[PDB]
Design a protein around this ligand. Structure first.
Ligand code: HEM
Ligand code: A1H6U
Length: 375
């Protein structure tokens, strides 16, 4: 069994199990703004409502779930405040009334004061009926940015892939125990169960077409998830008034911050983070935007003996085929994902991307080159 200190759930994996939907009454002013971003932004009332807030203390957020919900509320408000209507009129100073509690809560959770994948995907969900299974029809997001932005489809389909991966994550300890105990048959069975689970996760990706449309995703959702790191619109970063004197740069919400495929890259010895390349530097940097428990899970997998080295040292075709079935399942997920990116980003950008495609192609290439046979 995976240690409880890694915050990995048997059912939902890296996702936050049963996230909190409501904050204590003390934070009603935060919740009102966050729940009505589409309306407040469109009417030009968002920035005024934010500037009218009183500085609320974070001491009444007494557990992980309420703190995670609060991080999500303040992060969505910060994106709406900075980007406004998403047309270029930006704010370069985040008011102290929100910047101070946001940075305090971020320091406590060891995350940067910007919306990350763990907020907008991992904690941004609920079951409609708690007695029904984790299916799209029985689920919803907690917050969106604009009407018709497809954030429910995008965040929920990412979450459903994250949940499909949970059945593979839970087999990780069986793999390491079989290697330590020198139990070849147990290792082969575990590698095939991981491959089977990752193969099932591919079908989950097909749901993206039913719930997201390219125009809205490209022109709207992409704008609100942007950060202020290497961004010409906020060339020096954002001023977090009352917390830091100088403006600070933070990258926008990204699945590069996700642990879902990354723990399988680490498990299988696919060295995505090796070297000084752009792709490797970006994946390493994005670990800082990942929850500490999850960052710790990855580095502890890196400390464990190599599964690839063990499989290569045995002269066993069945073991190599089971290992390659896991690598191939990752290649298939990344190849399908590249087709999604062509439809949702490449084509809309052409009707007005290269670096995004190159990063994804490098990660997919590194995965494919790890196959022991399929060449
Ligand atoms: C509308 C659909 C989607 C689009 C347009 C899209 C786009 C992108 C882009 C452009 C990146 C590169 C990193 C960045 O620019 O921030 C990325 C990375 C990534 N995405 Fe998505 N994505 C989509 C759906 C999904 C879903 C549903 C998942 C499921 C969890 C997912 C998982 C990943 C992962 C794991 C990465 C990191 C790179 C890798 O490990 O291969 N994506 N995505
Ligand atoms: O990398 C980002 C991201 C955020 C959240 C989930 C997710 C799934 N795949 C990519 N994801 C962004 C989102 C906006 C467009 C460019 C990529």
């Amino acid at each position: 069994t995976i240690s409880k200190e890694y915050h990995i759930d048997e059912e939902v994996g890296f996702a936050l199990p049963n996230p909190q939907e409501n904050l204590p009454d003390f934070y009603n002013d935060w919740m009102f703004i966050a729940k009505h971003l589409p309306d407040l932004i469109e009417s030009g009332q968002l920035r005024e409502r934010v500037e009218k807030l009183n500085m609320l203390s974070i001491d009444h957020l007494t557990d992980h779930k309420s703190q995670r919900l609060a991080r999500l509320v303040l992060g969505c408000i910060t994106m709406a405040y900075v980007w406004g209507k998403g047309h270029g009129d930006v704010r370069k100073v985040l008011p102290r009334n929100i910047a101070v509690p946001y940075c305090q809560l971020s320091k406590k959770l060891e995350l940067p004061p910007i919306l990350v994948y763990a907020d907008c995907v991992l904690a941004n969900w609920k079951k409609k009926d708690p007695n029904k299974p984790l299916t799209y029809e029985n689920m919803d997001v907690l917050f969106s940015f604009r009407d018709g932005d497809c954030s429910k489809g995008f965040f929920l389909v990412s979450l459903l892939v994250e949940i499909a991966a949970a059945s593979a994550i839970k087999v990780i300890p069986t793999v390491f125990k079989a290697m330590q105990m020198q139990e070849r048959d147990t290792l082969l069975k575990a590698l095939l169960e991981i491959a089977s689970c990752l193969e099932k996760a591919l079908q989950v990706f097909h749901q993206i077409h039913d719930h997201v449309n390219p125009k809205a995703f490209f022109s709207v959702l992409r704008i609100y998830l942007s950060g202020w790191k290497g961004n010409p619109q906020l060339s020096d970063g954002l001023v977090y008034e009352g917390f830091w004197e100088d403006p600070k740069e933070f990258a926008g919400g990204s699945a590069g911050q996700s642990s879902v495929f990354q723990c399988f890259d680490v498990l299988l010895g696919i060295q995505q983070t090796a070297g000084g390349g752009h792709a490797a530097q970006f994946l390493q940097d994005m670990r800082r935007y990942m929850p500490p428990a999850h960052r710790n899970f990855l580095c502890s997998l890196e400390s464990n003996p190599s599964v690839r080295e063990f499989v290569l040292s045995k002269g066993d075709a069945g073991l190599r085929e089971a290992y390659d079935a896991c690598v191939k399942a990752l290649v298939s997920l990344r190849s399908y994902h590249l087709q999604i990116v062509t439809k949702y980003i490449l084509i809309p950008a052409s009707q007005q991307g290269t670096d995004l495609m190159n990063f994804l192609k490098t990660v997919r290439s590194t995965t494919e080159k790890s196959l022991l046979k399929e060449g």
